[PDB]
Design a protein around this ligand. Structure first.
Ligand SMILES: C=CC[C@@H]1/C=C(\C)C[C@H](C)C[C@H](OC)[C@H]2O[C@@](O)(C(=O)C(=O)N3CCCC[C@H]3C(=O)O[C@H](/C(C)=C/[C@@H]3CC[C@@H](O)[C@H](OC)C3)[C@H](C)[C@@H](O)CC1=O)[C@H](C)C[C@@H]2OC
Lengths: 107, 352, 414
């Protein structure tokens, strides 16, 4: 499913709310280390509304555990990931993912 | 509907076809001013240039011999807009002699343009520029990463096949000034004498073992200043390490000075090692010449110059370049499987 | 009198040639009109040029010149070409109605059983056998004014006008008794109940401000675009007459063409048929928000369009769209559990006024002559030219009714 293996934690007083928007910087990967996307390729972060289904369910179940200013190393199994259908052009069917999401600020 | 934002240049659409790219020197200034604007060439012209460059390279020996004034460089990894900066900070190819070391293609969005420009300039100048083969000029490696997709999207696959038949014949030793030795990676314990690397053939895909796959894949030790030839590697998992006694023995058995490299990317762009007590010169220098590798490290680069028995090192800067989607998508395949989900969700929400 | 009545006839040739032609031009010009029921409409227009030129005006010479100098060398010939105009037009009108009937009663059977390459063979089969009957006494002379004794008039009445005006008015009475059932069968009342439940205005007018009142839809990035694709009547609000069609555009029995066309219409902004740089920038900017920069979006759009042009004008059309997108399997991702395909009934009130005008006008002559054949004869001996001219006008309006249809209308303005 979804796993969390913290790399370098920090403060944990503040947690994301039910319907607020987070800002993250992430560096996608695959199982063997090849990279296919980044939020540092372009110089602008990612934003998404927690609780609604516009991000894959792995993020929506995992990112809520971390707090302000922590890095991690997620692991999205094929269930919560793009699944057997996958995506055309990048992710083959039945493909594990390994992100590097590091929450930055909370709005 | 003409244009929404007008502060960006427009890519020219007409592919040049032997119009002014050939005169038998091929034109260079037009190649500059046309490839800097993301234009394209006709397929026949590309095949012509690549096959002529391969024909020139075919007859080259397996160990180059060069005179004194040279300007060694590092690997590039297909960054065109930094290759231009390198050519501007160094000399013009008419006035100064070069020697490239590293790979030319993989892990970038402008491999084909860089290889076209370099091979054309080698066709024009056949004696004042030399190239060396790296680890990223094989079949499996360029099939794995983003090079096959480049040739299949921007050009035809015939270009890619000809490009492989072109990479097949490069040299791999690059002796220089009868004093140094500039190989891409590192030496191997199974190779002992300079004459030993004058017999092997390099006209095929490298195997998984032997001197051919140990020259291009080896690495130096990362714990210098330790205790006591062929310790295995971990990060690459394909070749061998080597220790300071091995380097000293190789430099004493045959009269040389040092060895140069182009793998280990560094935050400073260059880093020497401990000086050899026999002569006082350093024994290993690592050169990296691609700023902002993978757009993450945020490091400088460097280019080494050599003249008048003075070894000085010059630094380098960054430069911007345009944007492409990962794996060369197009907006229709980029945003159809979002329109589908949104439309279906809205309809199911409204009809119930 | 003389000059003025000549003016009416001269305008007539001009109008028939004009209207019979314009349809020919639109069908040949666009490739979206190459349906299975747009080649038979072209046969009707063409048997409307032939009687649009050789036959209408020669009769016109006879009005007052009292004799035709074309002479016997072919003056009787005119009589053939005239009787191969009513007898083809009536057989092509009867095919149209029996085939709309087979498609509508069971859509799947017509949908897959026959192909365009067989239709041209059926229309060629219609015109010439009709020509064969007419030519038989046109030279046999079993019989420039035309007379016969009793035989050929009866034979002509028994074959072309009477027998076709029986079959063509019966199968069409089926298409009309077995097409009003699907419009109200236990399922097109559910959406009606939903309509009555949803309209707060209580006026049958669902405006965009009224759909925005739903709770879980007030955040969807693209609602205006879809509601404007539904807005076919082009006034800014949705009514029941088009809501059913919009929903039925998605189904389980639908095919690739309509779903992929609808996916195309999301990007296109003014129904013109061409995607421009501004359109493929605005439609995407709304769906991307503020994660990418602006200049990067512009550059990737430029590259997509440059790799998409195969015609050189700088814009992309539907065929190039299919070339680029085809192979992503979008047809399976758009599905709702609604079960009805109201696509056949899209055009059955314009391929049906024609099966009426062609019967309400040339019916009197055939009726009148068979009476004139009888012993009783009024002082109306000049009426044969008073009322068998009524007809040449009919072929004139056969393309006039078609401008109501949207596909023809875009070419008609163009
Ligand atoms: C412009 C129009 C699209 C619009 C795109 C952007 C805002 C630009 C944004 C940087 C996307 C990137 O574009 C370069 C790129 O990001 C990836 O590289 C990626 O790291 C990824 O997996 N991400 C992005 C970061 C959040 C998690 C996940 C995601 O939530 O993606 C979501 C996603 C694709 C949902 C799918 C939809 C299909 C369902 O079947 C599936 O359900 C299982 C879920 C994103 C948020 C959607 O909202 C897409 C959009 O809104 C994908 C590998 C491919 C994706 O391009 C498509």
């Amino acid at each position: 499913g979804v796993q969390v293996e913290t790399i370098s934690p920090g403060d944990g007083r503040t947690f994301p709310k039910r319907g607020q928007t987070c800002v993250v910087h992430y560096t996608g990967m695959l199982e063997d280390g090849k990279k296919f996307d980044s939020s540092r390729d372009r110089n602008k972060p990612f934003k998404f509304m927690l609780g609604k289904q516009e991000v894959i369910r792995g993020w929506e179940e995992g990112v809520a555990q971390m707090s302000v200013g922590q890095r991690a190393k997620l692991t999205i199994s094929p269930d919560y990931a793009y699944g057997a259908t996958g995506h055309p052009g990048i992710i083959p069917p039945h493909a594990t993912l390994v992100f590097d999401v590091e929450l930055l600020k909370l709005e | 509907t003409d244009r929404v934002v007008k502060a960006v240049p427009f890519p020219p659409s007409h592919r040049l076809t032997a119009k002014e790219v050939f005169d038998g020197k091929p034109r260079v200034d037009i190649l500059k001013a046309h490839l800097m604007k993301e234009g394209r060439l006709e397929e026949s012209v590309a095949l012509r240039i690549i096959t002529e460059g391969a024909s020139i390279l075919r007859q080259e020996k397996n160990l180059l011999d060069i005179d004194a004034p040279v300007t060694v460089c590092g690997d590039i990894h297909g960054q065109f807009f930094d290759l231009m900066k390198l050519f501007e900070v160094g000399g013009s190819p008419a006035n100064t002699r070069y020697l490239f070391l590293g790979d030319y293609v993989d892990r970038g969005y402008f491999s084909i343009e860089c290889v076209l420009y370099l091979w054309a300039l080698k066709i024009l100048y056949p004696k004042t520029l030399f190239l060396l083969r790296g680890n990223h000029e094989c079949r499996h490696l360029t099939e794995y990463f983003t090079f096959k997709q480049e040739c299949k999207i921007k050009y035809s696959e015939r270009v890619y096949d000809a490009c492989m038949d072109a990479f097949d014949c490069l040299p791999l030793a690059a002796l220089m000034n009868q004093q140094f030795l500039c190989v891409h990676g590192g030496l191997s314990p199974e190779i002992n004498t300079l004459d030993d690397i004058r017999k092997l053939d390099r006209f095929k895909e490298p195997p998984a073992y032997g001197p051919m796959c140990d020259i291009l894949w080896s690495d130096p030790l990362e714990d210098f200043g330790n205790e006591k030839h062929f310790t295995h590697n971990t990060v690459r998992g394909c070749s061998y390490f080597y220790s300071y006694p091995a380097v000293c023995d190789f430099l004493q058995h045959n009269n040389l000075l040092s060895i140069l490299r182009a793998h280990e990317a560094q935050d400073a762009g260059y880093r020497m090692y401990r000086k050899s007590q026999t002569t006082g010169f350093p024994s290993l220098i690592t050169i990296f010449s691609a700023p902002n590798y993978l757009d993450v490290y945020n490091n400088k680069a460097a280019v080494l110059k050599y003249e008048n028995n003075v070894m000085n090192i010059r630094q380098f800067n960054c430069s911007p370049h345009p944007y492409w989607l990962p794996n060369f998508m197009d907006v229709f395949t980029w945003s159809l499987p979002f329109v589908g989900e949104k439309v279906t969700e809205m309809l199911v929400n409204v009809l119930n | 009198w003389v000059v003025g009545m000549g003016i009416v006839m001269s305008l007539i040739v001009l109008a028939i040639v004009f209207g019979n032609v314009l349809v020919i031009t639109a069908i040949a010009k666009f490739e979206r009109l190459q349906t299975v029921t747009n080649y038979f409409i072209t046969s009707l227009a063409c048997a409307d040029l032939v009687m649009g030129l050789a036959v209408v005006p020669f009769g016109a010479a006879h009005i007052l010149m009292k004799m035709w100098t074309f002479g016997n060398f072919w003056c009787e010939f005119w009589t053939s070409i005239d009787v191969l105009c009513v007898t083809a037009s009536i057989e092509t009108l009867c095919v149209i109605a029996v085939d709309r009937y087979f498609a509508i009663t069971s859509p799947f059977k017509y949908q897959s059983l026959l192909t365009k390459n067989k239709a041209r063979v059926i229309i060629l089969m219609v015109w010439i056998v009709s020509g064969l009957t007419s030519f038989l006494p046109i030279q046999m002379h079993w019989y420039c004014d035309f007379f016969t004794n009793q035989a050929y008039a009866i034979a002509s009445s028994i074959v072309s006008f009477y027998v076709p005006l029986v079959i063509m008015v019966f199968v069409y009475s089926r298409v009309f008794q077995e097409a009003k059932r699907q419009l109200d069968a236990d399922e097109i009342k559910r959406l009606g109940k939903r309509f009555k439940k949803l309209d707060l205005d209580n006026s049958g007018s669902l405006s965009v401000e009224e759909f925005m009142s739903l709770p879980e839809l007030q955040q969807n990035p693209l609602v205006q675009r879809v509601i404007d694709i539904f807005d076919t009547d082009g006034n800014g609000e949705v009514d029941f007459k088009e809501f059913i069609e919009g929903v039925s555009q998605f189904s389980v029995k639908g095919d690739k063409e309509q779903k992929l066309r609808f996916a195309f219409r999301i990007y296109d902004m003014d129904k013109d048929g061409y995607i421009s740089n501004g359109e493929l920038f605005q439609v995407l900017k709304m769906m991307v928000g503020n994660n990418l920069k602006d200049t990067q979006l512009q550059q990737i759009v430029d590259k997509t369009i440059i790799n998409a042009d195969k015609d050189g004008d700088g814009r992309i059309s539907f065929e190039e769209f299919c070339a680029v997108v085809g192979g992503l399997d979008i047809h399976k991702k758009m599905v709702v559990d609604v079960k009805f395909c109201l696509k056949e009934h899209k055009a059955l009130k314009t391929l049906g006024i024609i099966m009426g005008t062609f019967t309400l006008c040339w019916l009197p002559f055939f009726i009148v002559n068979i009476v004139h054949v009888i012993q009783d004869n009024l002082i109306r001996k000049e009426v044969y030219i008073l009322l068998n001219w009524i007809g040449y006008v009919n072929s004139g309006f056969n393309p006039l009714i078609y401008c109501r249809s949207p596909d023809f209308r875009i070419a008609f303005q163009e």
